[PDB]
Amino acid sequence: PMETQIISDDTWKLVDEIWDKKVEEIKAEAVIQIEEEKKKPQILMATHFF
Amino acid sequence: LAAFEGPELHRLPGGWANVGIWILIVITMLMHYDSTLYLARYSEKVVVPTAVVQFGPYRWVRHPIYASTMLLFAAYCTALRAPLSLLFLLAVCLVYYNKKAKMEEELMVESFGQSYSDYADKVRHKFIPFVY
């Protein structure tokens, strides 16, 4: 053998980071995605007139 | 008070005296619609102005929608022929509307800086053309 180490140990840290960010984003997206209170028409826009 | 003060609806004149009323109505709705169309064109969100507006009614009066709204009531007090109510709405609407104009103006002067400063230097007259 003659080949020493290759790309890095820090690039593995970066790819672990992006893996964890995507996993956490999926985890957050799965459970807090749907919540609805109301969508009422805003047809008394008083800040234009009153 | 305007309905109380004004003469009875059959005693108020017609003919060529009711043609000025139509003129006031149409000029009011032109000024207000122009002011609204100029104000709402530059805002990305519902009320978030991206830039400083200085066109049309904005090159005459710094707060044109407000002036147009009061001019609507002024023409209304002219319609039933009650000038005293016209003066009283002048007082009260001017007071409240100047308060809100001061709050809005200080906000957007803080948020914009020199642009609205030189714009207000260009048009000092805040509500009525060269009256106030």
Side-chain angles (χ1 to χ4, degrees):
Chain A
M2 161 283 323
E3 289 268 329
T4 89
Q5 207 192 12
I6 316 90
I7 311 131
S8 185
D9 314 327
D10 319 323
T11 64
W12 298 140
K13 276 155 205 154
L14 306 187
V15 67
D16 286 22
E17 280 169 15
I18 185 183
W19 179 276
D20 298 351
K21 303 302 201 33
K22 179 75 187 245
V23 158
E24 281 335 280
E25 168 264 357
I26 283 180
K27 250 60 166 305
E29 216 268 358
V31 306
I32 77 164
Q33 211 53 26
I34 167 63
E35 72 300 336
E36 176 69 29
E37 77 284 356
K38 204 55 204 100
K39 291 177 64 181
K40 270 309 176 179
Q42 200 74 15
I43 208 164
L44 283 152
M45 201 65 198
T47 85
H48 196 124
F49 316 104
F50 167 71
Chain B
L1 185 128
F4 170 84
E5 225 301 312
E8 282 214 346
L9 258 170
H10 74 298
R11 314 280 309 283
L12 49 89
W16 277 86
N18 289 171
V19 78
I21 294 305
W22 277 106
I23 292 157
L24 268 298
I25 288 197
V26 295
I27 69 150
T28 42
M29 56 47 51
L30 329 182
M31 304 341 281
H32 157 266
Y33 212 37
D34 291 337
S35 319
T36 281
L37 191 57
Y38 286 163
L39 185 56
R41 172 262 160 275
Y42 282 117
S43 39
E44 175 46 67
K45 287 149 189 34
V46 156
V47 281
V48 173
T50 52
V52 156
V53 311
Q54 38 195 316
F55 320 102
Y58 281 102
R59 78 186 59 256
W60 297 84
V61 158
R62 254 185 285 123
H63 304 95
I65 278 163
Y66 303 153
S68 81
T69 281
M70 172 46 179
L71 200 56
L72 167 76
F73 320 110
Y76 142 83
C77 299
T78 316
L80 203 43
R81 335 292 157 183
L84 200 136
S85 43
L86 180 142
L87 302 189
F88 292 356
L89 327 183
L90 268 180
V92 55
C93 209
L94 258 192
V95 162
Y96 173 79
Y97 253 64
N98 171 40
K99 162 178 181 186
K100 196 196 181 176
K102 286 307 180 57
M103 291 325 88
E104 172 139 1
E105 195 162 43
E106 77 87 42
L107 175 67
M108 47 176 197
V109 166
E110 166 262 358
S111 174
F112 277 71
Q114 195 35 249
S115 58
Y116 195 85
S117 276
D118 58 64
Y119 168 66
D121 298 316
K122 203 176 68 172
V123 289
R124 156 60 203 84
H125 306 298
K126 188 174 40 215
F127 277 131
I128 314 181
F130 50 84
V131 180
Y132 186 88

